[PDB]
Amino acid sequence: TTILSVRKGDTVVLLGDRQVTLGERIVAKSSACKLRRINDDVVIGFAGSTADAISLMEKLENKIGEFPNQLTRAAVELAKEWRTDRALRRLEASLIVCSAEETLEIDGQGNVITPEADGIVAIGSGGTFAKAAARALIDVDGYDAEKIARKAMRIATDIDVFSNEHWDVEVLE
């Protein structure tokens, strides 16, 4: 999987590939969407199984419900619960949560990561390749957020045998 978010200027994008892999060996679906809206202001992308990811999304919605305009706090509360709940701990996933304003990466080790100044966040087997590629373009004139994101996904997914070339795209802002 490769989920990438680039914020540049008045815009932020989120991309994910669509490959589901079994046994680290075979592609079982090449057209699975890994991004979900949860309102007008917030989208989220996931690496991990449908069930794991969705269970964690729902718990996150509850944390946004409780802390309505502190995205970061909700994220942290989610991570806290995730690490202490026996059930949740049996799940593997990583999430990126995106608003017009903030972007957060949350994993099952309990890290809650915001971008450096460059506005770049990524998860998945392909994520680091994407981050690298994006960073190469972040300060180059003519490259808006989307263009950066697309070129980086191409590069990352070409590299990552566990990610494909078919992407979902969200934009905010």
Q: Contact between 162 and its own copies (CB under 8 A)?
A: yes
On whether the CB atoms of residues 109 and 91 are closer than 8 A, the answer is no
Q: Contact between 62 and its own copies (CB under 8 A)?
A: no
Three-state SS for 70? coil
Q: Contact between 168 and its own copies (CB under 8 A)?
A: no
User: Per-residue b/e over 11-29, b at no fewer than 16 CB within 10 Å?
Assistant: ebbbbbbbbbbeeeeeeee
> Quick one: which segment of 9-17, 35-43, 62-70, 153-161 binds its own copies (CB under 8 A)?
153-161
| Residue closer to its own copies, measured from CB, 38 or 76 | 76
Residue closest to 3 by CA, chosen among 23, 24, 18? 18
Q: What's the rounded Cα separation, in Å, for the pair 145 and 129?
A: 17
Positions that interact with its own copies (CB under 8 A):
20-22, 24-32, 48-52, 54-55, 76, 79-80, 82-91, 105, 107, 109-114, 116, 125, 128-137, 140, 151-152, 155-156, 158-162
Q: Supply the residues annotated as catalytic.
A: 1
